[PDB]
Write an enzyme that holds these catalytic residues in place. Structure first.
Site, mmCIF file in Angstrom:
data_model
loop_
_atom_site.group_PDB
_atom_site.id
_atom_site.type_symbol
_atom_site.label_atom_id
_atom_site.label_comp_id
_atom_site.label_asym_id
_atom_site.label_seq_id
_atom_site.Cartn_x
_atom_site.Cartn_y
_atom_site.Cartn_z
ATOM 1 N N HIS A 31 -5.575 -7.526 13.512
ATOM 2 C CA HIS A 31 -4.306 -6.825 13.426
ATOM 3 C C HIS A 31 -3.842 -6.444 14.833
ATOM 4 O O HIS A 31 -4.652 -6.043 15.666
ATOM 5 C CB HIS A 31 -4.476 -5.571 12.555
ATOM 6 N N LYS B 148 0.843 -1.188 0.000
ATOM 7 C CA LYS B 148 0.000 0.000 0.000
ATOM 8 C C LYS B 148 0.884 1.245 0.000
ATOM 9 O O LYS B 148 2.108 1.145 0.158
ATOM 10 C CB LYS B 148 -0.945 0.002 1.217
ATOM 11 N N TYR C 105 15.696 32.070 4.437
ATOM 12 C CA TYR C 105 14.553 32.753 5.016
ATOM 13 C C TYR C 105 14.736 33.204 6.463
ATOM 14 O O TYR C 105 15.287 32.486 7.300
ATOM 15 C CB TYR C 105 13.286 31.887 4.877
ATOM 16 N N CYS D 38 14.101 25.315 2.273
ATOM 17 C CA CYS D 38 13.128 25.889 1.353
ATOM 18 C C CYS D 38 12.279 24.806 0.667
ATOM 19 O O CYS D 38 12.516 23.614 0.815
ATOM 20 C CB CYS D 38 13.847 26.786 0.326
ATOM 21 N N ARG E 290 0.964 -10.995 6.662
ATOM 22 C CA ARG E 290 0.915 -9.768 5.875
ATOM 23 C C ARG E 290 2.231 -9.062 6.190
ATOM 24 O O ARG E 290 2.367 -8.388 7.219
ATOM 25 C CB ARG E 290 -0.291 -8.937 6.293
ATOM 26 N N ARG F 121 -9.326 0.067 15.352
ATOM 27 C CA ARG F 121 -9.419 0.720 14.050
ATOM 28 C C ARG F 121 -10.654 0.255 13.264
ATOM 29 O O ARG F 121 -11.680 0.943 13.249
ATOM 30 C CB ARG F 121 -8.141 0.432 13.274
ATOM 31 N N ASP G 1 12.053 23.857 -2.481
ATOM 32 C CA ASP G 1 12.762 23.041 -3.457
ATOM 33 C C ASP G 1 14.267 22.901 -3.230
ATOM 34 O O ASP G 1 14.926 22.107 -3.894
ATOM 35 C CB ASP G 1 12.521 23.602 -4.866
HETATM 36 C C1 LIG Z 1 -3.920 -4.655 8.194
HETATM 37 C C2 LIG Z 1 -2.389 -4.625 8.037
HETATM 38 N N1 LIG Z 1 -1.694 -5.788 7.822
HETATM 39 C C3 LIG Z 1 -0.336 -5.818 7.679
HETATM 40 C C4 LIG Z 1 0.427 -4.643 7.746
HETATM 41 C C5 LIG Z 1 1.910 -4.752 7.591
HETATM 42 O O1 LIG Z 1 2.501 -4.280 8.797
HETATM 43 P P1 LIG Z 1 4.046 -4.029 8.899
HETATM 44 O O2 LIG Z 1 4.540 -2.798 7.712
HETATM 45 O O3 LIG Z 1 4.445 -3.396 10.523
HETATM 46 O O4 LIG Z 1 4.861 -5.606 8.622
HETATM 47 C C6 LIG Z 1 -0.256 -3.393 7.973
HETATM 48 C C7 LIG Z 1 0.500 -2.139 8.041
HETATM 49 N N2 LIG Z 1 -0.075 -1.013 8.236
HETATM 50 C C8 LIG Z 1 0.604 0.242 8.614
HETATM 51 C C9 LIG Z 1 1.686 0.020 9.697
HETATM 52 P P2 LIG Z 1 -0.641 1.382 9.185
HETATM 53 O O5 LIG Z 1 -1.385 0.734 10.275
HETATM 54 O O6 LIG Z 1 0.072 2.718 9.741
HETATM 55 O O7 LIG Z 1 -1.618 1.685 7.917
HETATM 56 C C10 LIG Z 1 -1.667 -3.389 8.118
HETATM 57 O O8 LIG Z 1 -2.399 -2.250 8.339
HETATM 58 C C1 LIG Z 2 12.638 32.602 -6.635
HETATM 59 C C2 LIG Z 2 11.220 32.660 -6.050
HETATM 60 N N1 LIG Z 2 10.408 33.648 -6.484
HETATM 61 C C3 LIG Z 2 9.154 33.805 -6.057
HETATM 62 C C4 LIG Z 2 8.587 32.941 -5.087
HETATM 63 C C5 LIG Z 2 7.171 33.175 -4.637
HETATM 64 O O1 LIG Z 2 7.205 33.396 -3.225
HETATM 65 P P1 LIG Z 2 5.866 33.515 -2.374
HETATM 66 O O2 LIG Z 2 4.994 31.956 -2.252
HETATM 67 O O3 LIG Z 2 6.300 34.040 -0.701
HETATM 68 O O4 LIG Z 2 4.811 34.723 -3.140
HETATM 69 C C6 LIG Z 2 9.391 31.859 -4.568
HETATM 70 C C7 LIG Z 2 8.833 30.927 -3.563
HETATM 71 N N2 LIG Z 2 9.507 29.955 -3.075
HETATM 72 C C8 LIG Z 2 9.260 29.298 -1.758
HETATM 73 C C9 LIG Z 2 8.785 30.291 -0.669
HETATM 74 P P2 LIG Z 2 10.781 28.538 -1.298
HETATM 75 O O5 LIG Z 2 11.787 29.574 -1.370
HETATM 76 O O6 LIG Z 2 10.679 27.947 0.192
HETATM 77 O O7 LIG Z 2 11.013 27.385 -2.408
HETATM 78 C C10 LIG Z 2 10.700 31.710 -5.046
HETATM 79 O O8 LIG Z 2 11.512 30.709 -4.589
#
Ligand SMILES: Cc1ncc(COP(=O)(O)O)c(/C=N/[C@H](C)P(=O)(O)O)c1O
Ligand SMILES: Cc1ncc(COP(=O)(O)O)c(/C=N/[C@H](C)P(=O)(O)O)c1O
Lengths: 380, 380
Positions: free
Chosen positions: A165, A38, A264, A310, A218, A135, A312
């Protein structure tokens, strides 16, 4: 497939094959393995991991909701798939046509589905019991029998499975685990007959008590080489192999003079003459802002993230003048140094499960098999 | 498209239209609006927002890296696009051919691009200067002249613009802001001729000092109806319309008796006779585990998220026994109550920017335009 930013994640399918094959060895031959892929295989790539797990000995797949199961079908997967969560009664016909088994836990769901479906494909259900997780799942005997009856009456409804589970299978102390296991045993007796598939174990339960798994496990988190929890790390039967790693490259390098500010809010200030590097990965890539006091690896050495992260990109203090294009490792190994998902998880103050799931669609996945690149998956 | 799980996000394009049109009215006829649409338009949907913004008065688009620009081009957007981040010298031809403008800040980049590209499309470059952000950009006089020379010298290289980015434009204290503004005016003098496009303002600087933005504004966060910072809020010229909302539905309801435990680690214990609901949204959807004590809206009331948040599901304490199918609002309005993205950010200890960006590919986006459902975008 191709990508045009020097930031990518690598998924080692050889590791995945080993983790699953070791389980196949550990469990009794009569016990099947259902690989849970999943959430796009815990962020590792749904179809790539599925194909691999099936090769190593897995016979079925599990997903969270219907769309995930349908996506696997469209990509060529023909193995059985169980939807672990809830689904719409109106979609029973689509699940039946695509041969997707469903989880059921309430009678009013079945009331509704009987009126919307009438053959010719059979729908395979897995009755879900709540033995202490709180759950999904039935908790009464009357409701359990009502569900079974409604399934028994419809000629196209089939009870293929029955499961529960565990909420604390990863805790060293097994008190609650024991209550749940014993409760499941009692609840099983409420069924007129045993369906062919009875399951309850996740990674932790199956790795610790292989003999208490009935006929299907599972297998999740451990398949990706991550321990269910640090507590049971020493309790694991075979060594796990981490499959996920994250990398990037320096796109800008510059020397700052004492007093200049970075990022920032102008939070950081260089105090000596220092080299600052810029990498193309930010919080929209899943490298959350809470990680601003963490570090990355550059040329086999630890380098701190400097200033605020930031959307990106982010900045790091370099040991000295390094060339643009120098590989940076966010998760993985470089020389003798290593940053594991558990390290990131600790810093984010979460569990390892959440880390690879948060590395977004924006980040390309490069799959390795037999030590060579198999394919590149760029979501955008 | 359509989805098969009752969890979805709603994007109000009318709000986005108004946020842009108001700026278009607030700005001079000569000034262009470049809608910042990186990170899938801050988690809102790239094409849907890009198209709406263009209709509202924007003349250009800005993206983070090459792949995002190519994606817009492949979805029919034919308006100008500027890549704000770094790219490879070897991809310059791809950018030219697709009419994508690139940001340049190092002379060795150009020297490499020159040897690799000979024609026939012209590539428009925007010279980034670093005035005090410490991220990307040129800092010295002779680096600038060398870049200009390398561009002037190439028959297909064109210097279309030059810009800088402010690190503290959202801070009430305008001291670092004026330092950067002054530094910029000075660095502009290293250019023989002022290019056609000179820009420096993000949402904060453009909404605060609309006249000291030259001839192009880069509009981001404010377009989505979100304030750059809580401190700037009462200084903005017009009210912003929030465009993003998130909803789910109860897929299970049950009455727990005292002593009963809920979810992983059994960290929540029912003390009275409580009704517990299960909703199909979890951390793999961007609803991080850190939101465990947060309140969602159900039937007009605040209801706490009880127990640990799972990968695809989480539990809430209901006001009473509500029917399965009842709408739960995580972000948005439910009659009398409202949960804004600023409320979620406050609980996660982050800034609003990060929230919509984290709501994953797994969550469908339903778009509204002219008060009607317009489109459904489901990534998987
Ligand atoms: C019903 C069921 N079976 C098996 C697994 C596999 O468990 P695991 O990755 O610990 O071997 C999960 C995992 N789920 C996540 C752990 P969540 O509950 O957060 O959706 C599950 O929800
Ligand atoms: C070069 C540049 N110009 C303009 C903007 C627009 O800024 P805003 O959403 O405050 O109007 C950003 C936004 N970037 C994020 C804020 P980050 O720098 O975290 O990738 C930018 O990186």
């Amino acid at each position: 497939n191709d990508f045009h930013r020097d930031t990518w994640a690598e998924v080692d399918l050889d590791a995945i094959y080993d983790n699953v094959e070791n389980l196949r060895r550990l469990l009794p031959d009569d016990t099947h393995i259902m690989a849970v892929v999943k959430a796009n295989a815990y962020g590792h790539g749904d179809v790539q991991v599925a194909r691999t797990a099936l090769e190593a000995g897995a016979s079925r797949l599990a997903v969270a909701f219907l769309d995930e199961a349908l996506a696997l079908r469209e990509k060529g997967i023909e193995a059985p798939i169980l939807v672990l969560g809830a689904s719409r009664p109106a979609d029973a016909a689509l699940a039946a046509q695509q041969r997707i088994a469903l989880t059921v836990f309430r009678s009013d769901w079945l009331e509704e589905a009987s009126a919307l479906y009438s053959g010719p494909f059979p729908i395979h259900f897995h009755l879900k019991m709540d033995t202490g997780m709180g759950r999904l799942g039935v908790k009464d005997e009357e409701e359990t029998k009502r569900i079974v009856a409604l399934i028994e009456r419809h000629p196209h409804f089939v009870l293929e499975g029955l499961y529960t589970h565990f909420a604390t299978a990863d805790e060293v102390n097994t008190d609650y685990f024991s209550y749940q296991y014993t409760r499941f045993l009692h609840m099983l007796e409420w069924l007129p007959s045993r369906p062919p598939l009875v399951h309850c174990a996740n990674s932790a339960a199956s790795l610790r008590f292989p003999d208490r798994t009935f006929n299907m496990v599972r297998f999740g988190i451990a398949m990706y080489g991550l321990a269910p929890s640090p507590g049971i790390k020493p309790l694991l039967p075979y060594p796990l192999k981490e499959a996920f790693s994250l990398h990037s490259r320096l796109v800008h390098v510059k020397k700052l003079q004492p007093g200049e500010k970075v990022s920032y809010g102008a939070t950081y200030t260089a105090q000596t003459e220092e080299w600052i590097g810029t990498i193309p990965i930010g919080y929209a890539d899943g490298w959350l802002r809470r990680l601003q006091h963490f570090h990355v690896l550059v040329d086999g050495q630890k380098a701190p993230i400097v200033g605020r992260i930031c959307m990106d990109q982010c900045m790091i203090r370099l040991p000295g003048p390094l060339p643009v294009g120098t590989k940076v490792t966010l998760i993985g190994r470089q020389g003798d140094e290593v940053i594991s998902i558990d390290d990131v998880a600790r810093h984010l103050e979460t569990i390892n499960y959440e880390v690879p799931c948060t590395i977004s669609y924006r980040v390309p996945r490069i799959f390795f098999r037999h030590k060579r690149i198999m394919e590149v998956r760029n979501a955008i």
